[PDB]
């Protein structure tokens, strides 16, 4: 009757680059987790600390929907306990995560013949991200002794790189759209009930 705005999250025309992942708050609304399936060629729906089947019975204080795009071979990194270029330097889930991870193949939208280069990921970072950290800096990465002084060169690398999405690349290199739902419990009124 007062549906949560899951519609503008899962069915958004544009998704964010993973390094600049999007976060939407969700509160004061009736959440129906059954609309979520969208007929996508490689749909994936995993939950942690909670049962996917009984989600419609539960209440939470607040819900967070984070969204972004990655490679198919990278979808496995969006899980508690994982490491890899995405989990370490772009989007990190906590080990004690309570929530759900929904991913699907978006080759139809996010690829094109001649290539879509608009989606970026961080390739270089000196240390791992904390859970739910977002790093959007574009400082030249210093891989050696000499200072970079803002100019790319040897041992001086622009830290972000663009994905190349074309429809005929293999599935591991095809684009996937991801939504992460985190469920918060406080000693506060619940405002997201199914």
């Amino acid at each position, epitope marked *: 009757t007062n549906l949560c705005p899951f519609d503008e999250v899962f069915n958004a025309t544009r998704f964010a680059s993973v390094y600049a992942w999007n976060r939407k708050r969700i509160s004061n609304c009736v959440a129906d987790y059954s609309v979520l399936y969208n007929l996508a060629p490689f749909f994936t729906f995993k939950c942690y600390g909670v049962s996917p089947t009984k989600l419609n019975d539960l209440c939470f204080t607040n819900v967070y929907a984070d969204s972004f795009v990655i490679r198919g*071979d990278e979808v496995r990194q969006i899980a508690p306990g994982q490491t890899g270029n995405i989990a370490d330097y772009n989007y990190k889930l906590p080990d004690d995560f309570t929530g759900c991870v929904i991913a699907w193949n978006s080759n139809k939208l996010d690829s094109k013949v001649s290539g879509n280069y608009n989606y970026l990921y961080r*390739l270089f*970072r000196k240390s791992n991200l904390k859970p739910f950290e977002r790093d959007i800096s574009t400082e030249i990465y210093q891989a*050696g002794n000499k200072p970079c002084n803002g100019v790319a060169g040897f041992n001086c690398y622009f830290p972000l790189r663009s994905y*190349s999405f*074309r429809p005929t690349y293999g599935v591991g290199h095809q684009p996937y759209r991801v939504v992460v739902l985190s469920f918060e419990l406080l000693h506060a009124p619940a405002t997201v009930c199914g």
Partner: antibody
Amino acid sequence: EVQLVESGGGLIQPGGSLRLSCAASGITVGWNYMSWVRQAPGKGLEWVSVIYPGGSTDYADSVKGRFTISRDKSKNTLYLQMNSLRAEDTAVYYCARDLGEAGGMDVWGQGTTVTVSS
Amino acid sequence: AIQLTQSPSSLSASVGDRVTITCRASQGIPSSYLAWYQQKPGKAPKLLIYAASTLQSGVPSRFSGSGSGTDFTLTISSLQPEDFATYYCQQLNSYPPAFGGGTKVEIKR
């Protein structure tokens, strides 16, 4: 000026252990993806292991549970600890700096030879 | 995973020849995920080309690369005596990376 100098190879019985060292100059080991790659006599190249700038590690399947990559930032040195060695591990071992899509494996060590035989 | 197949296994050429070496991927990858290396007997591999067409610093301009999807190429426009060697292609941005089986460039007579 930029180089990787390896040491620690040699002759060993199956089941034994060896440690390989890769001292660096001109790159900062702790700030790079550093890989180990091996080449068996008469064969091609086989990736062995990697350590990320932030510390995560990865291994070829044939080596998991036996080999361990690590680094000493103070000595600017990369290491590979090799336990439970097998005859198939016989190879020239190279360390290299990996830049991925941003550059290849652009800097390589001279190689150190590992022979595993009874 | 990806498998890279190199072609031909060996090729015979003379100094001054235009020589082209092919690397074929099993599935289809960004052009920016391929690299080319040269190796001579008893020597470490040396990087030639990364991201399929970028000439590594210090490598003579007679070396060039091209390709995207599944079919990649390394070309030497005018072969010199020091070019006689073995050539490998490699997949980037992946652990474990695939390596091609190699192409040995050899002297014609």
